[PDB]
Amino acid sequence: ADVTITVNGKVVA
Amino acid sequence: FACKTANGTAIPIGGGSANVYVNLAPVVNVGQNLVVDLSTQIFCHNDYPETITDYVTLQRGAAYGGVLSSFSGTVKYNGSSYPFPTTSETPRVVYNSRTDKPWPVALYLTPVSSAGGVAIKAGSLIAVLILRQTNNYNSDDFQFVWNIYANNDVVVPTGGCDASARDVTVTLPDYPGSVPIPLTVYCAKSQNLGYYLSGTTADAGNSIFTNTASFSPAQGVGVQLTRNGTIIPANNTVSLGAVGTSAVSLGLTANYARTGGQVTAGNVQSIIGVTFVYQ
Ligand SMILES: [Ca+2]
Numbered sequence: 001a002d003v004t005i006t007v008n009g010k011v012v013a
Numbered sequence: 014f015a016c017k018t019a020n021g022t023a024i025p026i027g028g029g030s031a032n033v034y035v036n037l038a039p040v041v042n043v044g045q046n047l048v049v050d051l052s053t054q055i056f057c058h059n060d061y062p063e064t065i066t067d068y069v070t071l072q073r074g075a076a077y078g079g080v081l082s083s084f085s086g087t088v089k090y091n092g093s094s095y096p097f098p099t100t101s102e103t104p105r106v107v108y109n110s111r112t113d114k115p116w117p118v119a120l121y122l123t124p125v126s127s128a129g130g131v132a133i134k135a136g137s138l139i140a141v142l143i144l145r146q147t148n149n150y151n152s153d154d155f156q157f158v159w160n161i162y163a164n165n166d167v168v169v170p171t172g173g174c175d176a177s178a179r180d181v182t183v184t185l186p187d188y189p190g191s192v193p194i195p196l197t198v199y200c201a202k203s204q205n206l207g208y209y210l211s212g213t214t215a216d217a218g219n220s221i222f223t224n225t226a227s228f229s230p231a232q233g234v235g236v237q238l239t240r241n242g243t244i245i246p247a248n249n250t251v252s253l254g255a256v257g258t259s260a261v262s263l264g265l266t267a268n269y270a271r272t273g274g275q276v277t278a279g280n281v282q283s284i285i286g287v288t289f290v291y292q
Contacts, residue, residue, distance in 0.1 A: 002287055004287070005267075008185065009185035009281030
């Protein structure tokens with residue numbers, strides 16, 4: 001890939 | 014104590030602000046120095062040199078627009094060099110004549126690594142320089158604010174089509190939520206660009222990228238990229254079209270998407286590739 005996208009998320013309780 | 018620009022605009026006794034319009038080198042590359050010499054446009058003079066001596070300084074200098082995001086710099090004042098944007102008040106220059114003399118200020122700006130294409134666009138605010146005037150007479154402490162604008166486009170040489178960054182990481186709000194993704198592209202010569210996404214998906218529509226996290230991973234959810242209100246499946250060409258020296262956004266947005274189960278707490282991570290298609 002020309003660009004790599006890292007997508008950080010989080011689910012709380 | 015008064016000041017005046019080369020293009021008419023002046024600032025009277027007591028301080029005040031003024032917009033300066035400077036011509037810039039339309040092409041500047043890495044290692045080369047873009048020089049904004051303001052000793053040819055900003056002039057000042059002492060109104061009562063027979064009784065009062067004026068003291069003038071470059072109090073603070075801030076970078077804006079393309080200078081702030083594509084240029085590292087120093088500032089020349091009365092022969093001495095200082096960090097730009099400034100972090101301390103400079104020594105003073107004495108003004109003791111009614112004859113309008115140059116304000117000894119110059120900007121030395123070198124392009125950074127990420128610079129390329131139209132780094133400084135026309136009519137855009139490139140700097141703000143605060144002159145500070147005092148005297149040995151009164152307790153006058155006046156500020157002459159100078160808003161430095163670029164008259165023209167400044168292009169950082171680039172070869173072919175290059176993207177904003179190679180590693181773009183974006184953080185999502187706690188489930189659920191969405192985030193814009195800061196990703197741009199610029200081409201030296203205007204070319205028709207497209208692009209597609211790559212990665213591992215969990216759905217039949219091949220759009221919901223799997224949560225790659227192996228620390229405390231949250232199940233049930235994944236990441237889905239959207240553009241112009243429309244979900245972009247993996248391996249699906251999105252044509253940006255005519256792309257030139259101006260940055261053209263890919264318009265991506267990171268979203269949460271449901272797998273087909275029930276969402277549990279924990280980390281979420283997806284590594285999505287962007288590959289450009291030419292012609
Ligand atoms: Ca490329």
